């Protein structure tokens, strides 16, 4: 069928009160919800690796990707904190730590952070040099960049950046830090793997800069937009520093 | 690189001004690298105001050759300029910030075309306040902004007409009329306000003809 069979797997996220089985034990109601969230997350990040899932989920109609972005712009702090893990695991980005300050979660997404493979017993210098020193190929195609550029263009076309700005402003701090780091990673990937016409107007951010410069709105939204832009500049400086 | 190091670290501002002025459009393909933009970003936050003007003109010109470097610093600088406009109530700082905003909007047309609304709101609310430098400054900025963004200023041309005719005609002071006349002619060639102000303001043709004999 058209829009009712494959789109069932993103039903734990789109439906806020989702009941999968009609007769279940009422004692387990939270663990069942986390199990539904985990299985639906695995199914969503498993359909975006196949071309028949990418094309069928991003159809130009009322597709199943626009219902995934539209429920992200709704202030429900349980679905909104769970969709960010799906967005982090789709683009193969590392997850930050669960905190409220940007300067603590910015340090956990450092590419030169210590890992357990870099110890002397396992992988002393060679496994560290694989991570921090770059590859010798400067003209190889690297098909992963092709796939990530296609996925990023398909997500930007359905309005992901406006939804990320809305999650950054009108939410808690625990989710604002994670959405700010996600927006920084997407804006860094845009000026790296996207063509110039796709990515010469993304770095302006009109919906966030017009909120950070409007003195008619309440001052909390303006100040958190200015703080978000300062954190985006700090993330850009961290990205242009490099691994040490 | 030696010229940029000298223009950054020299004590007296005359050599710094000569260095920051001599790097014209012939060096546009070579100043858009990494370390040259990192030196110009140091040149942006200078003590004296003229080198700040010159560095923000160079960076607003350079911002389309390598936008990934220049976009966050220009967003932060635009927010700082509007915060200097509204929040700080000193006329000198507001004049300098209006001049800096006009340099940024004259050297970078494509980036500030989506930021027309709060900038024009701030400049109009600065023109409606209860030295003539700030007035001809903001007239030059609003003329360049009218030239950059066409047909999206039709919701603003009425208030601008009512303000600029009260500053043109019935001049209680000896203010600059040439920049007001240029600004009035600059927002009718972009918006398309052709025949309507002749009847909406029945004294416009008379005061436009009086300037030829006085």
């Amino acid at each position: 069928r058209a829009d009712v069979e494959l789109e069932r797997i993103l039903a734990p996220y789109t439906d806020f009160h989702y009941r999968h089985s009609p007769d279940t034990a009422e004692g387990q109601l939270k663990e069942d919800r986390e199990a539904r969230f985990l299985a639906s997350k695995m199914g969503i990040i498993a359909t975006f690796r196949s071309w028949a899932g990418i094309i069928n989920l991003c159809k130009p109609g009322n597709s199943g990707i626009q219902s995934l972005i539209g429920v992200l712009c709704i202030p429900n702090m349980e679905i909104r904190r769970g969709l960010l893990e799906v967005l982090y695991d789709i683009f193969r980005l590392p997850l930050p730590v669960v905190t409220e300050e940007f300067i603590e979660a910015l340090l956990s997404v450092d590419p030169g952070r210590f890992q357990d493979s870099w110890r002397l017993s396992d992988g002393f210098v060679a496994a560290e040099a694989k991570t921090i020193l770059p590859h010798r190929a400067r003209s190889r195609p690297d098909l992963m960049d092709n796939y990530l550029a296609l996925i990023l263009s398909a997500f930007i076309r359905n309005g992901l950046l406006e939804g990320l700005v809305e999650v950054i402003t009108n939410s808690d701090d625990h989710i604002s830090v994670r959405a700010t780091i996600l927006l920084g990673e997407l804006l860094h990937m845009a000026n790296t793997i996207l063509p110039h016409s796709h990515s010469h107007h993304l770095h302006c951010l009109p919906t966030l800069m017009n909120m950070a410069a409007s003195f008619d709105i309440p001052k909390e939204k303006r100040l958190r937009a200015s703080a978000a832009l300062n954190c985006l500049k700090r993330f850009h400086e961290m990205k242009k520093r490099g691994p040490k | 690189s030696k010229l940029l190091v000298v223009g950054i670290t020299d004590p007296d501002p005359d050599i710094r001004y000569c260095v920051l002025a001599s790097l014209d459009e012939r060096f546009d393909a070579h100043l858009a690298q990494a370390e040259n933009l990192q030196a110009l970003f140091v040149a942006l936050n200078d003590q004296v105001f003229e080198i700040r003007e010159l560095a923000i003109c160079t960076v607003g010109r350079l911002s389309s050759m390598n936008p990934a470097f220049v976009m966050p610093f220009l967003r932060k600088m635009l927010i700082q300029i509007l915060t200097e406009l509204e929040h700080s109530g000193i006329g000198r700082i507001k004049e300098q910030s209006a001049r800096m905003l006009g340099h940024l909007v004259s050297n970078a047309p494509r980036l500030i075309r989506p930021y027309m609304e709060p900038i024009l709101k701030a400049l109009i609310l600065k023109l409606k306040d209860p030295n003539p430098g700030v007035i001809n400054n903001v007239l030059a900025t609003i003329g360049e902004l009218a030239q950059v963004s066409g047909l999206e200023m039709r919701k603003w041309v009425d208030e601008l007409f009512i303000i600029i005719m009260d500053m043109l005609q019935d001049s209680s002071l000896l203010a600059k009329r040439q920049v007001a006349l240029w600004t009035l002619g600059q927002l009718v060639a972009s918006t398309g306000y052709v025949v309507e102000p002749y009847r909406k303001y029945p004294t416009l043709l008379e005061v436009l003809l009086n300037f030829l004999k006085t």
């Binding site: 190929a137 003209s139 195609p141 063509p195 110039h196 242009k240 | 690298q33 390598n66």
Partner: peptide
């Protein structure tokens, strides 16, 4: 992977990346 290839693809409304992997921040030509 070449300039002629991107110029051929531009006529059929398909854009491409015009920079290499040498520099992180390449100046737009």
């Amino acid at each position: 992977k070449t300039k002629q290839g991107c110029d051929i693809l531009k006529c059929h409304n398909w854009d491409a990346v015009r920079h290499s992997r040498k520099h992180l921040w390449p100046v737009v030509p």
